[PDB]
Amino acid sequence: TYIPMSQRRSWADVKPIMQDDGPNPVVPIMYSEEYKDAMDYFRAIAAKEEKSERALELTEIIVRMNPAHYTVWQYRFSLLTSLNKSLEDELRLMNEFAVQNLKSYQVWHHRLLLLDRISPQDPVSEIEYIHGSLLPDPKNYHTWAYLHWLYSHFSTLGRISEAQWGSELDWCNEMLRVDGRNNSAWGWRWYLRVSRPGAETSSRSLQDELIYILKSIHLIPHNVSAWNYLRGFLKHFSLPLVPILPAILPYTAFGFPMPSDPLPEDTPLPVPLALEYLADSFIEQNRVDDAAKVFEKLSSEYDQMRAGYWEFRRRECA
Amino acid sequence: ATEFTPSVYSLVSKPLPSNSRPSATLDEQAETEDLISQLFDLTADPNALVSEHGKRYSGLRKQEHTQFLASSFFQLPGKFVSLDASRPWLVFWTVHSLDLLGVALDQGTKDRVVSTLLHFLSPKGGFGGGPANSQIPHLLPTYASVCSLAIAGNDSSTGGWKDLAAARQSIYEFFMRCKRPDGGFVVCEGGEVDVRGTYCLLVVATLLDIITPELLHNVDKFVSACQTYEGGFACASFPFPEPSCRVSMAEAHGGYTSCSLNSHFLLTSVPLPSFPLSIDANAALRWTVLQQGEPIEGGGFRGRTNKLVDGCYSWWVGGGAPVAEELVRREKSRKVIPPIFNRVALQEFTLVAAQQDPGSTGGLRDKPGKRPDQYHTCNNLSGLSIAQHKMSHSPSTVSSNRLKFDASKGLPAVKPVAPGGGWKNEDERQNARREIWANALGWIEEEGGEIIVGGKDNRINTTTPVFNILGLRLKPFINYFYCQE
Ligand SMILES: CCCC[C@H]1CN(c2cccc(Cl)c2)C(=O)CN1Cc1cncn1Cc1ccc(Br)cc1
Ligand SMILES: CC(C)=CCC/C(C)=C\CC/C(C)=C\COP(=O)(O)OP(=O)(O)O
Ligand SMILES: O=S(=O)(O)C[C@H](O)CNC1CCCCC1
Ligand SMILES: O=S(=O)(O)C[C@H](O)CNC1CCCCC1
Ligand SMILES: O=S(=O)(O)C[C@H](O)CNC1CCCCC1
Ligand SMILES: [Zn+2]
Numbered sequence A: 001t002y003i004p005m006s007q008r009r010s011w012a013d014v015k016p017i018m019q020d021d022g023p024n025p026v027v028p029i030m031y032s033e034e035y036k037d038a039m040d041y042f043r044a045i046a047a048k049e050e051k052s053e054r055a056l057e058l059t060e061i062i063v064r065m066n067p068a069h070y071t072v073w074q075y076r077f078s079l080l081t082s083l084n085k086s087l088e089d090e091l092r093l094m095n096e097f098a099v100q101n102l103k104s105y106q107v108w109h110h111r112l113l114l115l116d117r118i119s120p121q122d123p124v125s126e127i128e129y130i131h132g133s134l135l136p137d138p139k140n141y142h143t144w145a146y147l148h149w150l151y152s153h154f155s156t157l158g159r160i161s162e163a164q165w166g167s168e169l170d171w172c173n174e175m176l177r178v179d180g181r182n183n184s185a186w187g188w189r190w191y192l193r194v195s196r197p198g199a200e201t202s203s204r205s206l207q208d209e210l211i212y213i214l215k216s217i218h219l220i221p222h223n224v225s226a227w228n229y230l231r232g233f234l235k236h237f238s239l240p241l242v243p244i245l246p247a248i249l250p251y252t253a254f255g256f257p258m259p260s261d262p263l264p265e266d267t268p269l270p271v272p273l274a275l276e277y278l279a280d281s282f283i284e285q286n287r288v289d290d291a292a293k294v295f296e297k298l299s300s301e302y303d304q305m306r307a308g309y310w311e312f313r314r315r316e317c318a
Numbered sequence B: 001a002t003e004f005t006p007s008v009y010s011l012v013s014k015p016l017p018s019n020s021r022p023s024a025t026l027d028e029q030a031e032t033e034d035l036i037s038q039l040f041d042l043t044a045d046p047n048a049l050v051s052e053h054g055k056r057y058s059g060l061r062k063q064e065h066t067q068f069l070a071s072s073f074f075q076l077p078g079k080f081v082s083l084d085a086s087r088p089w090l091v092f093w094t095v096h097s098l099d100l101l102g103v104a105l106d107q108g109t110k111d112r113v114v115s116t117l118l119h120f121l122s123p124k125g126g127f128g129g130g131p132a133n134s135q136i137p138h139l140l141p142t143y144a145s146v147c148s149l150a151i152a153g154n155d156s157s158t159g160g161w162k163d164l165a166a167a168r169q170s171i172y173e174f175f176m177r178c179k180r181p182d183g184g185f186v187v188c189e190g191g192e193v194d195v196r197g198t199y200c201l202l203v204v205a206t207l208l209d210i211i212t213p214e215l216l217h218n219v220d221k222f223v224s225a226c227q228t229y230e231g232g233f234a235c236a237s238f239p240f241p242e243p244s245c246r247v248s249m250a251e252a253h254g255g256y257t258s259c260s261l262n263s264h265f266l267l268t269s270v271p272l273p274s275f276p277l278s279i280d281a282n283a284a285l286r287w288t289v290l291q292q293g294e295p296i297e298g299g300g301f302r303g304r305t306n307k308l309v310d311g312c313y314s315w316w317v318g319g320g321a322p323v324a325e326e327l328v329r330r331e332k333s334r335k336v337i338p339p340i341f342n343r344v345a346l347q348e349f350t351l352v353a354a355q356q357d358p359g360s361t362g363g364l365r366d367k368p369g370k371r372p373d374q375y376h377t378c379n380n381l382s383g384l385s386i387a388q389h390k391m392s393h394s395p396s397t398v399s400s401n402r403l404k405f406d407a408s409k410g411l412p413a414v415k416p417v418a419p420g421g422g423w424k425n426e427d428e429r430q431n432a433r434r435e436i437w438a439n440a441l442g443w444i445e446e447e448g449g450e451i452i453v454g455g456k457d458n459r460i461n462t463t464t465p466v467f468n469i470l471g472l473r474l475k476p477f478i479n480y481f482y483c484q485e
Helices: A033-047 A053-065 A070-082 A087-099 A105-118 A124-133 A141-156 A162-178 A183-195 A203-219 A224-236 A242-247 A272-284 A288-302 A304-317 B024-041 B062-073 B078-083 B087-101 B107-118 B139-152 B161-166 B168-178 B195-208 B219-224 B254-268 B281-290 B318-335 B343-354 B374-388 B395-404 B426-440 B471-482
Strands: B237-240 B245-248 B391-393 B443-445
Touching: A033 A053, A033 A070, A053 A070, A070 A105, A087 A105, A105 A141, A124 A141, A124 A162, A141 A183, A141 B237, A162 A183, A183 A203, A183 A224, A183 B245, A203 A224, A203 A242, A224 A272, A242 A272, A272 A288, A288 A304, A304 B281, B024 B343, B062 B087, B062 B374, B078 B087, B087 B107, B087 B139, B087 B374, B107 B139, B139 B161, B139 B168, B139 B195, B139 B471, B161 B168, B161 B471, B168 B195, B195 B219, B195 B254, B195 B426, B195 B471, B219 B237, B219 B254, B254 B281, B254 B318, B281 B318, B318 B374, B318 B391, B343 B374, B395 B426, B426 B471
Parallel strands: none
Antiparallel strands: B237 B245, B391 B443
């Protein structure tokens, strides 16, 4: 059975405070006795601004019932710093919170505040945990954003070595090997290879990156992630589209990779984004009529869901 | 008007090609294709003149959706505890959906809605997700509360707007405590930093006339740096040490692309020198239209590349298309018409796939197989409105708003927290009030651009881009706080 907190000697001194949203509020929620009791005493704890171990226990009980309660998460982090608690132990508790599927914006932000305050000399253990935590959800948006922050924050402090960057690309390359359609891993590769401030921009790196992109397209010619990465790559580095066209034309119905002698099975032609490449390549050659003809075919035959958009692109050329 | 918006029933439905390369993304994509295509095969084409015998009828079940939302004015089961910090969102999802569905509340219920939200207003500034004696203020409930007060409140002593006007200084001070030097905002004390907070803050600041130069510094740079190589926008950008450069922190996503486009659009109204920092509008429009699914997936929108279509992105991605379209129009004009997405297919997804099965609980949902909820009900209907009504930002309407604006009327100017944080003089502050007010009321529904798939009984009311409340709510609300009549 449940023992109310008014029947506990450890809380006999505390007068609970009731929730005050008026005598007849809209969108009320039918709380359990356990959840209402904990928030009643939390309202009192926060009123007296008590920083204690029982307040710490109370915050954990509350966030186990509602992991999205941002006020209680704010008070909990204020409790950990005031009482000089073990932030490493709190990370072990956060590991259990993900095991038992207690997740939200607030749990992920709490973990970030912990790593920020711990400020470890080497955050390799946290990087490894993030990699492993992607097993149930390889595309968890909060996790990928947290990984971006971890590398960005600790590289600002100078604590990401060259070997750490190198193994991170190894891990990212493996993620795209398991599922080349993981657009989150493509975005991570863009950070590692292009956008991060310490990235190398040389002639070999541009060739290496272009080889990886074309091979990824030839493996999965209908993968939108690879096509968008290609268009962003050429645009970001102001590279022309015409030289690469021999590798793209087989999809529209030279020392860079090429498609297979017959294309892989289940590869119907033409690939709509390959046509968009051809049309933009025509525009690069200042050939507006040829570009308008490709947009017209995209609008009326090959990408009819975007018929209005491809028609708008056709009208620009004329 | 349907020349370049073909129905999904008129197009061949074929799966995403595999290229003989199985993966987990393809497994889930093929499973949801079957789930959506089966329901379309069971449903009569809404563009048919006589409903087919044996198929389900796809008409908008507005009364079922009204009863689904009705439970919010009585009680919510215990499983709603996960939303106990988002109750202003439960209010907004309800009162805005009812506005879209054409269902009015009586004055007693509106008074309850106003009174409940005022119990969420903290004297130190801003709204929380619940009673002020239990929850600290937060940028996201602040937006939802302000918009809900615009929908359910009025200008009387019991209307709630008067209390909002009295709280303008404290809310502003709360906004400034949230501000970071790089231009980002924490959503609350010790909270996360993303473009949802920027969007929510800029909307409320625009509506309540509390925008200052110190509030906006670097805000345009934070948002602009969220644009990824795909064309859409990520949740945040990181400042490398004022900062030497800013880098996006994740994928382009429909939700954050909506907040970023809306934030940037709101900033273009501000008359500051070389502000806001530019974005790649062409790439944002391209990314938007690319997220509309194929006919086999009902023509709904997905939130990011190689993920699944979801009815809630009809508002997030579809509702961003008019904003991205206007930014593209401005850029083409600065260097010197068919719809930009399939307005018909999006309505078909809403009517066929996003509605709960008939005779059940009502409400709208993410996908077949998912329970409906208040969040997907509001955003499906908000996106449907965008598809039904052609929205555009009219420069002539904005010009007409400038001609009728009264700069001599207004609430007290807010006191900036830093000595030089306000506007330079009254001429510059009143010029800012006029531009921000005039552009906020610049969205129009184009005459003759209406497309109501399935018949006029499917028509819902017109929502406003950027703000996502009815124009008939937006005008008297913002006029109150700018003292315009
Ligand atoms: C009523 C239950 C709906 C769950 C939604 C909405 N919701 C939320 C909660 C409070 C306030 C606000 Cl505004 C939103 C979430 O936390 C999770 N959601 C799951 C979702 C559905 N379809 C896409 N998603 C992903 C997504 C994640 C973050 C946000 Br924020 C919005 C959407
Ligand atoms: C103003 C405001 C509150 C905007 C909300 C922002 C929004 C709509 C979405 C953010 C979604 C997110 C962080 C991850 C997607 O979750 P998911 O993986 O479950 O969904 P997905 O697979 O479709 O991307
Ligand atoms: O589908 S909705 O428009 O939301 C409303 C439902 O159709 C209710 N149907 C009633 C059945 C009994 C006779 C009167 C009508
Ligand atoms: O009068 S104010 O300072 O504006 C608001 C009061 O401090 C109440 N704050 C709450 C107390 C209980 C925990 C959540 C916050
Ligand atoms: O107004 S029109 O678009 O020409 C046609 C009507 O709207 C069709 N509405 C139906 C009528 C019969 C019950 C189910 C709805
Ligand atoms: Zn959704």
